[PDB]
Design a protein around this ligand. Structure first.
Ligand SMILES: N[C@@H](CCS)C(=O)O
Ligand SMILES: OC[C@@H](O)[C@@H](O)CO
Ligand SMILES: [Zn+2]
Length: 722
């Protein structure tokens, strides 16, 4: 049985990739030295593949993004960049003020760079897949170039600001594109390349028959090449149509869904091609029963096997993770150990009761009114307004404030244990007190504690929740040179003790103005983490939801009038197929309402970072919040159209009027344009004024003046609509 593997992490066991990248950018090392560091990573990867699988991928060490590489390869370099000079122009397209837009790669935590097609004509600008081939060739190693298929490349790109996803939009462009590919392939085939790994994950989106008619012709023109196509993240939209493509080797993801299998054993698989069962999950870190897996591969008479989806979604290795909770490590498996499981499967082909809180589990299993707030919005509204006494067009912020390097250095010392709880506790309060006075002096109406004690919105909570563990070196690539260690939800989730009361209560005792409670939603917490697969995702979300609700009662009991639940993954966690959204939102909505099941007089705020709400608004309407903050600066308020077009919308809206990803200071005229836009249809008493999002990434010198304008804006605004 032929064993395949792809997506093995490119970062290195010590994140040497990130270091080489940052050393080159800062000027600490030359391109030659950079390349040397790179070539070493290449050997590190091929070495791991060789020891476990039969097919060793090639062209996988992207210096920033593989979609970007695909774009450079076909000549898609925006005119603003001039002539492609090399890494220099390559990094200009990846980072900095002229860079391509970045965004999430399908439903994962990896971000790619969006190509911008400015001409209908593509051409072979650079054959990176051949370069890399001859490279592992010189070193005496045979590799199968790893490329992103032509259909997917276009589907992940834009033209004149719009995704290129309708069949009429792609048709013309594709013809000119496959020309570059065929050209690339022939060259590979000439130099002896015996196999090419083509990636078409876009085959799993909700495609029209017309898409397939188009895809079919794409692959007819490339039929003379030794292509092996892979699909993952969900089931392919048209099974029968997919198994008809002019390809001899076809990969399927049998882990992330039940449709591929069901389809394959209801309509069968063609005898003119070979199946490569993707049976090892590349998105979860759990050790699996290679038994029941061998049974699958056997019953399906699959000729090959491989991981379901890329392995770059997992950490490099579990080897040194020896500080994990009791028994956890024994059940884990990261990238390298996934490669080892494949080998064990090949060779053979030739733990549920863990961490459980039955009272918690049962608690979840058992009233209905725990998902519904005792009163309807219109009633809660009256009370809250009376309690709050806020002015018309009340101003507030999203939560975090810039971080002094001292703030950063100190929070790390507490983790490392260098200082004591008391000493860190004292430091944070001085940071909070300083923040509260500044905000009061600026003129804000509703204040926040600054989140100086939090590394990030998910990690902070993972370390305080039972059933969730964090790793030491489990670093995963997000984009460019930035990595993140995703927590691991290994058991039933419960909160042992209050997690935020000390800072929130303290912050509030220093002011007569309302100080927001600051929580992260249940979906977002699991969206950024790995979690158990042996239980419905809905259950894990409910467990975390209960944990957060318990925290909400504490804040209320303590006298906090406003509580904010950040739920930016509400939409991001959503299935890739919009057709599978119904089921998903059902439990995602319940999880949020369960977490925000507060008393009538507690004003709940929901914060979301989405650039557009037209496709989920019917789902948002169902969340029992009292106000929802949104990022309206980029659209200059136009993002409000989904709200003003929603019949019967009556909830408050935190209009983001400032783009916190740019260090610039939004002028008053600037912020007004947006507010004015939002006041076109919606009642003035529904509007709040705030920044697009949190300020943890900005600097105080840019924040103070921007905040002053924002307060100055609301002042003027109140004078008008007096
Ligand atoms: N409370 C967080 C929200 C991030 S979406 C912040 O203000 O940074
Ligand atoms: O249908 C999937 C699309 O919306 C993007 O997530 C692909 O990256
Ligand atoms: Zn945000």
């Amino acid at each position: 049985t032929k064993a395949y593997a792809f997506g093995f992490p490119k970062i290195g066991e010590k994140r040497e990739f990130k270091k080489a990248l940052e050393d080159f950018w800062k000027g600490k090392i030359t391109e030659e030295q950079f390349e040397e560091e790179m070539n070493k990573l290449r050997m590190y990867m091929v070495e791991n593949y060789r020891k476990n699988v039969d097919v060793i991928p090639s062209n996988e060490l992207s210096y920033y993004d593989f979609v970007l590489d695909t774009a450079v390869m076909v000549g898609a370099v925006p005119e603003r960049f001039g002539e492609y000079r090399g890494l220099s122009t390559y990094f200009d397209m990846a980072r900095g003020g002229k860079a391509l837009e970045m965004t999430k790669f399908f439903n994962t935590n990896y971000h790619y760079l969006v190509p911008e097609i400015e001409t209908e004509e593509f051409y072979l600008l650079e054959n990176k897949p051949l370069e890399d081939y001859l490279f592992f060739k010189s070193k005496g190693i045979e590799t199968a170039p790893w490329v992103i298929g032509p259909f997917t490349f276009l589907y992940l790109s834009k033209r004149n600001g719009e995704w290129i996803r309708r069949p009429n939009q792609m048709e013309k462009l594709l013809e000119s594109l496959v020309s570059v590919y065929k050209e690339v392939f022939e060259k590979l085939v000439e130099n002896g390349c015996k196999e090419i790994l083509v990636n078409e994950p876009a085959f799993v989106c909700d495609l029209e028959k017309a898409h397939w008619d188009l895809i079919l012709n794409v692959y007819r023109e490339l039929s003379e090449f030794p292509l092996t196509v892979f699909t993952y993240y969900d089931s392919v939209s048209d099974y029968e149509a997919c198994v008809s493509l002019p390809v001899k080797r076809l990969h399927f993801d049998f882990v992330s869904n039940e449709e591929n299998l069901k389809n394959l054993e209801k309509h069968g698989f063609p005898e003119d091609k070979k199946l490569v069962a993707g049976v090892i999950n590349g998105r979860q870190p759990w050790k699996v029963d290679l038994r029941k897996v061998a049974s699958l591969v056997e019953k399906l008479g699959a000729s090959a096997i491989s991981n379901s989806c890329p392995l770059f979604h997992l950490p490099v290795t579990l080897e040194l993770e020896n500080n994990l909770p009791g028994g956890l490590k024994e059940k884990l498996a990261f990238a390298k150990e996934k490669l080892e499981e494949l080998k064990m499967l090949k060779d053979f082909l030739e733990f549920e009761d863990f961490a459980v809180d039955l009272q918690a589990v049962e608690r979840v299993r058992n009233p209905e009114d725990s998902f519904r707030r005792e009163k309807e919005y219109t009633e809660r509204d009256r009370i809250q307004r009376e309690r709050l006494n806020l002015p018309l067009f009340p101003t507030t912020t999203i939560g975090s404030f810039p971080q002094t390097p001292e703030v950063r250095k100190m929070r790390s010392k507490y983790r490392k244990g260098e200082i004591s709880k008391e000493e860190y506790e004292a430091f944070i309060k001085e940071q909070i007190k300083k923040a509260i006075e500044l905000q009061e002096e600026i003129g804000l109406d509703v204040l926040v504690h600054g989140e100086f004690e939090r590394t990030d919105m998910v990690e902070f909570f993972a370390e305080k929740l039972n059933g969730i563990a964090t790793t030491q070196n489990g670093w995963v690539l997000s984009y460019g040179s930035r990595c993140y260690r995703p927590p691991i939800i290994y058991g039933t989730v419960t909160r042992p003790e209050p997690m935020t009361l000390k800072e929130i209560t303290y912050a509030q005792s220093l002011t007569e103005k309302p100080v927001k409670g600051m929580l992260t939603g249940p979906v977002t917490i699991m969206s950024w983490s790995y979690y158990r697969e042996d239980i419905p995702e809905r259950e894990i979300a409910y467990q975390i939801a209960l944990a957060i609700n318990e925290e909400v009662k504490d804040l209320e009991e303590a006298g906090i009038k406003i509580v904010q639940i950040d739920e930016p993954a509400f939409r991001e966690k959503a299935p890739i197929k919009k057709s599978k959204w119904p089921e998903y939102f059902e439990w995602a909505i319940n999880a949020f309402n369960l977490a925000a099941n507060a008393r009538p007089e507690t004003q709940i705020h929901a914060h979301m970072c989405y650039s557009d709400f037209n496709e989920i608004i019917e789902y948002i309407h169902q969340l029992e919040f009292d106000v929802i903050s949104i990022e309206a600066s980029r659209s200059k308020g136009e993002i409000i159209s989904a709200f003003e077009n929603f019949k019967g919308w009556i909830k408050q809206i935190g209009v983001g009027v400032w783009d916190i990803h740019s260090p610039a200071v939004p002028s008053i005229n600037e912020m007004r344009e947006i507010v004015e836009r939002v006041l076109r249809v919606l009642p003035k008493e529904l509007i709040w004024i705030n920044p697009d999002c949190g300020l943890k990434t900005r600097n105080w010198d840019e924040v103070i003046p921007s905040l002053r304008n924002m307060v100055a804006l609301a002042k003027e605004m109140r004078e008008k609509f007096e």
